[PDB]
Amino acid sequence: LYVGASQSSLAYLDGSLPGDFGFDPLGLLDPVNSGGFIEPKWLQYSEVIHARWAMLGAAGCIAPEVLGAAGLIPDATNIKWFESGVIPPAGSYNGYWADPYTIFFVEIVAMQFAELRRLQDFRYPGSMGQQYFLGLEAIFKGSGDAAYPGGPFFNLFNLGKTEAAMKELKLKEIKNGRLAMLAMLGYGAQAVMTGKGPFQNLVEHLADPVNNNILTNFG
Amino acid sequence: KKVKIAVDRNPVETSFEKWAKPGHFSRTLSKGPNTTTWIWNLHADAHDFDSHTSDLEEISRKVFSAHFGQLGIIF
Amino acid sequence: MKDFTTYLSTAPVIATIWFTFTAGLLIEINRYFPDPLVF
Amino acid sequence: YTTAIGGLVMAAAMFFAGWFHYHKAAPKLEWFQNVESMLNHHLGGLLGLGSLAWAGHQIHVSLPVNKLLDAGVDPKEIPLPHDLLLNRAIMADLYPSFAKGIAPFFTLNWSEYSDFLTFKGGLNPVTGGLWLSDTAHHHVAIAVLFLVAGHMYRTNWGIGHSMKEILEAHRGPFTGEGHVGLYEILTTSWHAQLAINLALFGSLSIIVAHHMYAMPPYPYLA
Amino acid sequence: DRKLWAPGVVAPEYLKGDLAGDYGWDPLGLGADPTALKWYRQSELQHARWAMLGVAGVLVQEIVKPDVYFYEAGLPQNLPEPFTNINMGGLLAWEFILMHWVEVRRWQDYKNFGSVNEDPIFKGNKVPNPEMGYPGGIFDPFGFSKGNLKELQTKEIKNGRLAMIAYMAFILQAQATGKGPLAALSAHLSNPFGNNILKNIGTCTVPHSVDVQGLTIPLTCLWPGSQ
Amino acid sequence: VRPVWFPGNPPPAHLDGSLAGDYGFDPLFLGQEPQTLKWYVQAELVHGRFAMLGAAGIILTSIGAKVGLGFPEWYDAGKVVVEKNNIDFPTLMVIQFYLMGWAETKRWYDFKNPGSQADGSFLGFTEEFKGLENGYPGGRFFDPMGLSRGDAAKYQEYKQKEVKNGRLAMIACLGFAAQYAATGKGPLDNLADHLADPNHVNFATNGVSIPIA
Amino acid sequence: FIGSSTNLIMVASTTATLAAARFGLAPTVKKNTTAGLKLVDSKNSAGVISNDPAGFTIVDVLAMGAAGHGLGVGIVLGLKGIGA
Numbered sequence A: 001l002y003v004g005a006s007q008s009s010l011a012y013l014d015g016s017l018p019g020d021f022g023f024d025p026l027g028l029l030d031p032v033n034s035g036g037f038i039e040p041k042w043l044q045y046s047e048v049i050h051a052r053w054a055m056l057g058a059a060g061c062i063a064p065e066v067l068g069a070a071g072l073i074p075d076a077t078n079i080k081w082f083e084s085g086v087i088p089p090a091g092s093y094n095g096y097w098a099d100p101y102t103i104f105f106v107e108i109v110a111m112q113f114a115e116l117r118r119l120q121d122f123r124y125p126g127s128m129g130q131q132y133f134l135g136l137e138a139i140f141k142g143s144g145d146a147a148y149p150g151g152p153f154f155n156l157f158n159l160g161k162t163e164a165a166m167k168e169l170k171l172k173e174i175k176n177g178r179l180a181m182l183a184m185l186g187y188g189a190q191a192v193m194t195g196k197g198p199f200q201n202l203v204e205h206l207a208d209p210v211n212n213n214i215l216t217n218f219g
Numbered sequence B: 001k002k003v004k005i006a007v008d009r010n011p012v013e014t015s016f017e018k019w020a021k022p023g024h025f026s027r028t029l030s031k032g033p034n035t036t037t038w039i040w041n042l043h044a045d046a047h048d049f050d051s052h053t054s055d056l057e058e059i060s061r062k063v064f065s066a067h068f069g070q071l072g073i074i075f
Numbered sequence C: 001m002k003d004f005t006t007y008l009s010t011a012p013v014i015a016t017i018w019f020t021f022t023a024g025l026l027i028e029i030n031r032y033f034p035d036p037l038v039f
Numbered sequence D: 001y002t003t004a005i006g007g008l009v010m011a012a013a014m015f016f017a018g019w020f021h022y023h024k025a026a027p028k029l030e031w032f033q034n035v036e037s038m039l040n041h042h043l044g045g046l047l048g049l050g051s052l053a054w055a056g057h058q059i060h061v062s063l064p065v066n067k068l069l070d071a072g073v074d075p076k077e078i079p080l081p082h083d084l085l086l087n088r089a090i091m092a093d094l095y096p097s098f099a100k101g102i103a104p105f106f107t108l109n110w111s112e113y114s115d116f117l118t119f120k121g122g123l124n125p126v127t128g129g130l131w132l133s134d135t136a137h138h139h140v141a142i143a144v145l146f147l148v149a150g151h152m153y154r155t156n157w158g159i160g161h162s163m164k165e166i167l168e169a170h171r172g173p174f175t176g177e178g179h180v181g182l183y184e185i186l187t188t189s190w191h192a193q194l195a196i197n198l199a200l201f202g203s204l205s206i207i208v209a210h211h212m213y214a215m216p217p218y219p220y221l222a
Numbered sequence E: 001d002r003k004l005w006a007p008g009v010v011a012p013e014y015l016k017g018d019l020a021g022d023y024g025w026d027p028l029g030l031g032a033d034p035t036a037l038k039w040y041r042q043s044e045l046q047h048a049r050w051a052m053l054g055v056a057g058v059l060v061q062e063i064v065k066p067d068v069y070f071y072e073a074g075l076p077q078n079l080p081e082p083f084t085n086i087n088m089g090g091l092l093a094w095e096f097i098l099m100h101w102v103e104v105r106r107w108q109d110y111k112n113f114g115s116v117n118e119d120p121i122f123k124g125n126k127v128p129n130p131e132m133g134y135p136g137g138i139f140d141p142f143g144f145s146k147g148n149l150k151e152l153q154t155k156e157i158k159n160g161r162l163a164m165i166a167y168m169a170f171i172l173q174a175q176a177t178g179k180g181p182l183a184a185l186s187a188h189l190s191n192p193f194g195n196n197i198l199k200n201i202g203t204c205t206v207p208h209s210v211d212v213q214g215l216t217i218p219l220t221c222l223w224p225g226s227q
Numbered sequence F: 001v002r003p004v005w006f007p008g009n010p011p012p013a014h015l016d017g018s019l020a021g022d023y024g025f026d027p028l029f030l031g032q033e034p035q036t037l038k039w040y041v042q043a044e045l046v047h048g049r050f051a052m053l054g055a056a057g058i059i060l061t062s063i064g065a066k067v068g069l070g071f072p073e074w075y076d077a078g079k080v081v082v083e084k085n086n087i088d089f090p091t092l093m094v095i096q097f098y099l100m101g102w103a104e105t106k107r108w109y110d111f112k113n114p115g116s117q118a119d120g121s122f123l124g125f126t127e128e129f130k131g132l133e134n135g136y137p138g139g140r141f142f143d144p145m146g147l148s149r150g151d152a153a154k155y156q157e158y159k160q161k162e163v164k165n166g167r168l169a170m171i172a173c174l175g176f177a178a179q180y181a182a183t184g185k186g187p188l189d190n191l192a193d194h195l196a197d198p199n200h201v202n203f204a205t206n207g208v209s210i211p212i213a
Numbered sequence G: 001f002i003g004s005s006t007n008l009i010m011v012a013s014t015t016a017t018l019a020a021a022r023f024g025l026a027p028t029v030k031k032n033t034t035a036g037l038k039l040v041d042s043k044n045s046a047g048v049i050s051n052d053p054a055g056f057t058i059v060d061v062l063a064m065g066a067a068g069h070g071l072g073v074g075i076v077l078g079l080k081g082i083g084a
């Protein structure tokens, strides 16, 4: 469907996976002699994980600048995404309730619990619903697909009642996630090249596109 | 005609069972020691991968892992 | 663990541990008793 | 100390890679016999990317730090490598071409970079070793040459070469059939490849010894 | 069938509508264990009743005494006569003893249903106690339970939930602005575009600590705002 | 069925839940053999009991130190006792080694031959050294209250409580050592410093734990 | 930079390399060359599905772009090296 399709990649891409456009010139989903991490289940799971994380990242990288330009948030906040303490050489914010290492330890424990339980459910489907977890195991059963667990919390409003609706929503999620991944890559590249925020780059380009682009930002 | 990533999953099991059996790689040394010569043979045919088996795939895999161990030593 | 102990019981591993123990004992003896030439 | 810790981590990674490739994911024989793809990667990726990465480090760290060391600056007062890599003011002061950014590279105005990419030759009169600007330019040229050479053999597309075709096309009247069967010999015998690699590797090692005493590349080495 | 909390969602199998105010809402599945469900029902009833009492107390206190801050009303210098500057230790002792007695009786009623209905001193004075958390008798002297108890319990739990939300709103409003709910409502009515959560947030009017007579009690806001 | 140290991971074969505090935690398979597991069970029980005594003593002494009682810290109590009281340190060490040697030697030879110490060769005492299980030496001397010879369910619950409290005390002693080597003060002094300011007084701000901070 | 000799030479070089392969004058992903420099069919493992009338795939675009860039960079640096 897309550009770069091949007869070899079409042997294993029959539209079963969500967002299958037959774009695989590097042949990473061939089930013939597959192992380790280069296999269809892990690759699709990693793509949906990167998709959701990049969606949150793109929104979180462009939200404080847009909210600051709109006057909703004060002037103490509204800093660039790479100047919020992420990279201390690029700038750090000292307005938090604690230093970034304490918050990092909190993130270590929190992310370890979430990610390790997620991994254990991927390795053993449904194993996160038997052991006692303060009664929360009733919603950690998931389904056969580790990428789409569902349940009372992960599917709060029980959307996608029909299989077609669920397929449509899955395709929308993967496309928005790919767009967000490209946006995050663009955010990093613009931060290294221009040295400013992404919304600032968008504004500067909208003012005069001929004098504001990658060709004029070289030197 | 197609260049891809061909692989086999879990061919050899990670265990210490063979660590207690010296000379398991060769059919001649698998019997055990009877003379001191055997001991020297145990060290002379250790890396001789094309003598343990005639399968080229096994030799290539052993070579790959030997290269990784060597780079670990260098690091 | 039985296989690991059997591997540690082989001649080179036992020789390494024994020589390390003997060398360490001799080194510590010469360290706490410097230059012993006579009794 | 940080480099030592990184080396220990890399050693553990190499050991884990060996264990993983022997007991968890062992490649088939057809994966090892992809000499065309292997050569393309070792030429472009390994050699070319390694030379390009070292050229980048030499341009951004070795060149300004060593220039300041040769200028008489105390090692404690020299800016940290990340300090030189974060702002363009210090680099522009030490090298005016840095004030133009990467713009002269894309505009085919490489001559503007004539302050850290030259052909000085000889040796540094202060340190006695080769000029690091010349070594950086050397690594840039080497990286471009190896990256160009890394797109010679065909892998999964029509463009590229087949080594068996080139070997079979070389045949004269005084040699009979020629290189027929050499490709099958080198793609199935590890000892033959080991012989060729060991011979060229040892020859290059001796060449390295001669080139290193003759042209000392490190400061205060001669 | 009853109306659920979300259109199109399917209620849990353990929520068939027997208990009052069952909207089929349990995203965490904390009601899977029947014992845990009964304990959480008792906890929700206690929270609902205490929140209704607190909300009504704050509102009536702000109406009758508009110059006394409900947040700082716990200080001994703000107590009315003849309880001003009273020793808080004896006050805490009184509350601890009485609350401990009644809560132990209620807990025993939860563990062993219908086992503490009788008065331990005067025999014959018992309570009917139809369900758990609903003793009645001396607790309901007006006798309003001899009728439609389902809709009455539904109204009770819904009003309690609304009061829980209301009291937490009171706490956050007093923490961000520094005034009672009625005063904050009047201030917002004076200028809706100037006094809202968009500008009052980020400021924590609660001090770092308070020195109640001799000992110092540490205090904090619910969010890391400006002290 | 039973909870494990890593949910979703199957418990090993050498850990079937018969022992107290069994969570199937053995990634290195150090206790795969039955005799080795028996020895390690007794070692863990002794370690936990000593750690419990140490944690209780350290906490009580630090409590007396925080209040105006003059109690020395746990890292200086030895010097304070040896210098305050005319007590010879090697003599005390030899006496302690003699008593511990006799007790631990009887325990060791009982581990080698269960019930051997009940022969009556030690002052005629027989049932006081018969032993109940591995690492659980019941009798009128070790358990004068008779809690190990009555109400089996309560006994198993107490066994689980003992192993869990022992592991917690071992972690507590390790924390005491790390806290003293990183901050330099006692455990209660660190607790007071943390309670005074938890957002800025922790391991991420001591300047020793995280070197890149 | 637009309209200069460098830009014009690079654009002409890339366009010339792209026009030769598409019109059957340079090696492509579909047509290989022999030892006598004669076009002939290939055995590509990818087999990129293209809609072009001559089968010009994206791989051909990348290869011709790299070839034109090399020829253009060499020509510009050669002219700048001879003072012309």
Ligand code: CLA
Pocket (backbone or CB within 6 Å): A034, A035, A036, A037, A038, B005, B007, D013, D014, D016, D017, D020, D025, D027
């Ligand atoms: C001799 C070197 C070597 C070679 C030839 C291979 C080859 C292979 N590996 Mg392997 N591996 C190696 C070393 C090597 N590995 C080492 C040192 C480790 C430890 C870190 C691993 C750990 C590893 C795992 C866990 C897996 C493989 C897998 C594979 C197979 C396919 C995946 C792949 O590599 O494609 C392409 C590679 C990628 C898509 C990811 C590469 C991204 C890396 C992280 C980029 C950074 C490294 C880069 C060189 C540094 C540049 C600097 C940068 C900061 C700019 C393939 C046959 C997979 C497999 O078994 O497939 C069957 C698999 O699951 N490898």
Ligand code: CLA
Pocket (backbone or CB within 6 Å): B012, B013, B014, B015, B016, B017, B018, B019, B025, B061, B062, B063, B065, B066, B068, B069, B070, B073, D015, D016, D017, D018, D019, D022
């Ligand atoms: C702890 C993990 C582990 C375990 C339990 C095993 C277990 C096993 N491996 Mg394996 N392997 C591992 C990790 C592991 N391996 C790693 C990290 C690598 C990459 C190097 C390999 C690569 C590998 C290959 C290629 C092969 C095995 C084989 C085997 C089987 C028998 C050989 C044997 O173990 O004898 C014990 C061997 C040794 C103790 C020698 C180890 C030497 C190390 C690697 C280097 C030492 C360098 C030394 C310090 C430098 C010398 C200087 C000197 C002065 C000290 C056995 C079941 C063989 C097999 O399956 O039989 C067909 C097989 O051919 N392994």
Ligand code: CLA
Pocket (backbone or CB within 6 Å): B063, B064, B067, B068, B071, D031, D032, D034, D035, D037, D038, D041, D042, D044, D045, D046
């Ligand atoms: C651009 C891609 C690339 C790169 C950088 C390498 C690099 C390397 N290969 Mg590899 N290889 C590749 C592609 C690549 N290969 C492909 C496509 C194939 C299949 C045709 C192979 C098949 C192959 C075989 C059979 C062997 C190698 C070996 C080696 C190592 C030689 C040791 C040395 O002297 O170099 C310098 C050493 C270093 C620079 C040490 C640092 C290592 C870093 C991490 C580079 C590793 C990059 C590599 C792509 C792994 C990243 C993938 C990710 C999954 C981790 C070297 C690290 C030998 C080996 O196994 O070594 C273990 C060997 O026997 N390769």
Ligand code: CLA
Pocket (backbone or CB within 6 Å): A057, A184, A185, A187, A188, A189, A190, A192, A193, D052, D053, D055, D056, D057, D059, D084, D085, D086, D087, D088, D091, D097, D098, D100, D101, D102, D105, D140
């Ligand atoms: C491989 C070698 C290498 C590397 C790594 C670098 C790297 C760098 N060079 Mg450099 N350079 C090199 C070779 C290299 N160079 C060579 C060979 C030459 C001689 C021709 C030069 C000459 C040169 C000059 C003259 C200058 C640089 C400059 C720079 C810096 C900025 C690059 C830039 O201008 O914007 C380019 C934009 C990018 C590279 C995009 C970055 C992409 C990022 C990493 C994406 C991250 C996205 C990620 C998903 C974000 C999510 C993270 C999450 C946690 C939120 C940079 C660190 C500049 C400088 O340092 O100023 C003093 C500068 O002026 N270089």
Ligand SMILES: CC1=C[C@H](O)CC(C)(C)[C@H]1/C=C/C(C)=C/C=C/C(C)=C/C=C/C=C(C)/C=C/C=C(C)/C=C/C1=C(C)C[C@H](O)CC1(C)C
Pocket (backbone or CB within 6 Å): A023, A024, A025, A026, A027, A028, A050, A053, A054, A056, A057, A058, A059, A060, A061, A080, A081, A082, A084, A086, A181, A182, A184, A185
């Ligand atoms: C298709 C294909 C096929 C063939 O065959 C093969 C190949 C070629 C390989 C392919 C391709 C691929 C690709 C393209 C890839 C890429 C990816 C990406 C880009 C990702 C990102 C990705 C990205 C990501 C994750 C990101 C994320 C982010 C985040 C979290 C962020 C966060 C944050 C925020 C909020 C804000 C602040 O201020 C900061 C922080 C805190 C930091």
Ligand SMILES: CC1=C(/C=C/C(C)=C/C=C/C(C)=C/C=C/C=C(C)/C=C/C=C(C)/C=C/C2=C(C)CCCC2(C)C)C(C)(C)CCC1
Pocket (backbone or CB within 6 Å): D144, D148, G061, G062, G063, G064, G065, G066, G069, G070, G073
């Ligand atoms: C008309 C038409 C069209 C259009 C088309 C086009 C327009 C295409 C294109 C395209 C292009 C426009 C492309 C481009 C490209 C580029 C490339 C591919 C590149 C590159 C690079 C490189 C590789 C380089 C290298 C180097 C360096 C880096 C330095 C040194 C030197 C050298 C050169 C080596 C369509 C289809 C729509 C429709 C119909 C017809």
Ligand SMILES: CCCCCCCCCCCCC/C=C\[C@H](O)[C@H](N)CO
Pocket (backbone or CB within 6 Å): F123, F124, F125
């Ligand atoms: C005035 C001297 C009083 C005794 C001083 C201490 C002596 C210690 C002797 C303790 C006796 C140990 C054994 C006692 C009883 C034995 O079980 C029976 N004789 C064995 O049949």
Ligand SMILES: CCCCCCCCCCCCCCCC(=O)O
Pocket (backbone or CB within 6 Å): F093, F094, F097, F098, F101, F102, F105, F108
């Ligand atoms: C300062 C050290 C003093 C030590 C005092 C020694 C007291 C005797 C203890 C020796 C116990 C030996 C146990 C027998 C050996 C064994 O059980 O295998």
Ligand SMILES: CCCCCCCCCCCC(=O)O
Pocket (backbone or CB within 6 Å): G035, G036
């Ligand atoms: C380094 C490459 C040298 C190539 C030499 C080519 C000589 C042309 C020989 C052509 C013979 C033929 O095709 O009939």
